[PDB]
């Protein structure tokens, strides 16, 4: 796997707040979430809310019947990453009590000035087999790929900030496994 188009973040000449007087545009920086998962079924999600009172918008799928306990752990908030452009990153994490048939990896690097560090290579390979030599098994003959790559925020000359995201490349080798019952 890798993030595609890391070099796009060298555009510091396109409606950027200058660092200082006569300087270049501030590069995309600050809070980032780099996550990817490979499973034989939908990634399974746990809802956790910074603020249980937040009104999430129509068109999105978010923890329902939120209570104050939703700000640490409310077991009602269970869901399947079954739809694109619907599950807000800030509401959901992989549910570590499930996801037996998926391997997920993620890093939150928070902070306002935190610099993006992005490595590209075609020489690195993650092994998806567990302690018992078994990788995700694809129910209904379907591979689930899941990802988030919020790189940080772009500051325009007004000072407003947007999340900037980038695409993720997946290459997955699968083999044929006999299974019973």
């Amino acid at each position, epitope marked *: 796997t890798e993030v595609i188009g890391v070099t796009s973040l060298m555009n510091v000449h396109s409606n950027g707040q200058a660092t200082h007087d006569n300087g270049a545009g501030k590069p995309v920086q600050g809070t980032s979430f780099h996550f990817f998962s490979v499973g034989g079924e939908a990634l399974e999600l746990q809802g956790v809310l910074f603020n249980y009172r937040t009104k999430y*918008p129509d*068109g999105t799928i978010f923890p329902k019947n939120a209570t104050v306990q939703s700000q640490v752990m409310n077991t009602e908030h269970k869901a399947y990453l079954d739809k694109n452009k619907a599950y807000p990153v800030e509401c959901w994490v992989p549910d570590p009590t499930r996801n037996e048939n998926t391997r997920y990896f993620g890093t939150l690097t928070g902070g306002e000035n935190v610099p993006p560090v992005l490595h590209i290579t075609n020489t690195a390979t993650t092994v998806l087999l567990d302690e018992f030599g078994v990788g995700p098994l694809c129910k209904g003959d379907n591979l689930y790929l899941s990802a988030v790559d919020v790189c940080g925020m772009f500051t*325009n*000359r*007004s*000072g*407003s900030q*947007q999340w900037r995201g980038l695409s993720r490349y997946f290459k997955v080798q699968l083999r044929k496994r006999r299974v019973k019952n």
Partner: antibody
Amino acid sequence: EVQLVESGGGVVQPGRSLRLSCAASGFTFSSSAMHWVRQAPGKGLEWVAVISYDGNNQLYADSVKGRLTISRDNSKNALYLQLNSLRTEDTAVYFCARDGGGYSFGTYFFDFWGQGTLVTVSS
Amino acid sequence: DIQMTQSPSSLSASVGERVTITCRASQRISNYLNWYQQKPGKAPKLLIYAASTLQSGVPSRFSGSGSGTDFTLTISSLQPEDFATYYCQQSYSSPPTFGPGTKVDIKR
């Protein structure tokens, strides 16, 4: 020719409701974020509401949040403003304005205004 | 919010004179400053966006300057159709806010 015709203005009692419409022509309505700006009689210009190109995102001025609803229908080239829980202070001509292209950065200005529609809130 | 104040409250001038209205934002707003003309009973028209950028179709006698807190609209040779109110508006923060406006009177 770029064109914006508001309608639905009239007299309305405090507490009651009223729905302004705005018929857009002669530009890709579906690509422009759209706005309502009001002017109380002889007073200044006050920004009221913005809606995204989509119709799916709305932002409102503190002074009107919870009493007005901006909506659109890109099939009909129409922008609407729903006025609820009206107050005498809400009396104004309401202007329909095309966003200048800055919606996304939170930087609003108005490169085309309609001739307006008058809303009078009195007992 | 960002408060916008304006020039003089009203200005008396004559056809052919050089007119200069000022605008002032309560804080730094870079060049996110826009100018409209309103005549009585009519809708405002965009004259200037981003402080000095003329809207297409607007006469070249109209010019805008300023960056930061202090901005000026300039009519080189005023024409009779320029007798109007002039509003400045910051586009820098939400909510976008207008100044009180400047009425431009026929001096006699």
